[PDB]
From Swiss-Prot, chains A, B:
Ca(2+) 2 binds at residues 57, 59, 61, 63, 68. This is Calpain small subunit 1. Ca(2+) 4 binds at residues 42, 130. Homodimer or heterodimer of a large (catalytic) and a small (regulatory) subunit. In presence of calcium, the heterodimer dissociates. The keyword DNA damage does not apply. One of its GO terms (cellular component) is cytoplasm. GO terms for molecular function: calcium ion binding; calcium-dependent cysteine-type endopeptidase activity. Regulatory subunit of the calcium-regulated non-lysosomal thiol-protease which catalyzes limited proteolysis of substrates involved in cytoskeletal remodeling and signal transduction. Essential for embryonic development. The keyword Signal does not apply. It is found in: Cytoplasm; Cell membrane. The lineage of its organism: Eukaryota, Metazoa, Chordata, Craniata, Vertebrata. The chain holds residues 94 to 266 of 266 of the full protein. Ca(2+) 3 binds at residues 87, 89, 91, 93, 98. The modification N6-acetyllysine is found at residue 84. Ca(2+) 1 binds at residues 14, 17, 19, 24.
Length: 173, 173
């Protein structure tokens, strides 16, 4: 029944081409946040959604098919739950001091240098990250872990990236 | 002469803290576009401006110093001229058949496969790319070429990276 209700909701979200475009994704993400007053956000903008589509578009059709959209949606749900749980002052945002505990609850255990870099690149002047920034960040972080893993065949902790693959991975994202 | 003019322009834009923030950049670019009606754009938004700054921020200050801003600004001017010239139909946007001409004038040679990915990420449903996306795409592309080159100084066409280095290189919105 859980499977059946979700299949139906994808069909309603994707429309006749049975894929979710960046614009489509934007409108449903914004409808979601409207329902959660505990999530502070300046909204999901079109370019952030284009990035999320690209990074999750493994079959390169330009849009999210059922399995791609399922994977992303279920990640957003789990990370939404985490954002709420680690926003302990109820600011609606993930502060610098909340961020490590949240990334780690999402299964991404980094280090001091890498957290600093994330806040520098993703958080605002006050070191705070709102909900669309946190989602955009994790979608990419998850993807980059998955891409390193796909490339690390022999399990050695070191990958070898050619220019073409570099370009593909960084630009279609 | 023109050298002291630009040094003073930087000083004026950077203001009190002597560096250019994502916000200051957003404000000067948006005022730039408003004085070229031939340059179609939905505007330079915070995500795009925070993301240009991040890729240009070589010294991890979170803001653009003189040399960083200069490199960025001079590229933007060069690319703006290319955009106007390669928009041969005067649609005010760079269409899929105009894009390879433009990128070649900018010094970039890419295979069809990578154009198709770039078009899907940065252009609309008709294949037409607006000015802020064009600039955002070129800034990223040049930055990725430079990051790769620095780690491949013998020109093998391949770099070798551990997970820490990989997140540092790729975690750019
Ligand atoms: Ca659709
Ligand atoms: Ca797809
Ligand atoms: Ca908080
Ligand atoms: Ca935001
Ligand atoms: Ca300043
Ligand atoms: Ca800097
Ligand atoms: Ca055109
Ligand atoms: Ca745009």
């Amino acid at each position: 029944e859980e499977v059946r209700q979700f299949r139906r909701l994808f069909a309603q979200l994707a429309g006749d081409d049975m894929e979710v475009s960046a614009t489509e994704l934007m409108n449903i993400l914004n409808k979601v946040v409207t329902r959660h007053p505990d999530l502070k956000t300046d909204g999901f903008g079109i370019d952030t959604c284009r990035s999320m589509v690209a990074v999750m578009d493994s079959d390169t059709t330009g849009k999210l098919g059922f399995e791609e959209f399922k994977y992303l949606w279920n990640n957003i749900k789990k990370w939404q739950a985490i954002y709420k749980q680690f926003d302990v002052d109820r600011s609606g945002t993930i502060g610098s001091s909340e961020l490590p505990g949240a990334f780690e609850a999402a299964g991404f255990h980094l280090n001091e240098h890498l957290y600093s870099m994330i806040i520098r690149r993703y958080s605002d002047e006050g070191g705070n990250m709102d909900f669309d920034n946190f989602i955009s960040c994790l979608v990419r972080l998850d993807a980059m872990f998955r891409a390193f893993k796909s490339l690390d065949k022999d399990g050695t902790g070191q990958i070898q990236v050619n220019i073409q693959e570099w370009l593909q991975l960084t630009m279609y994202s």
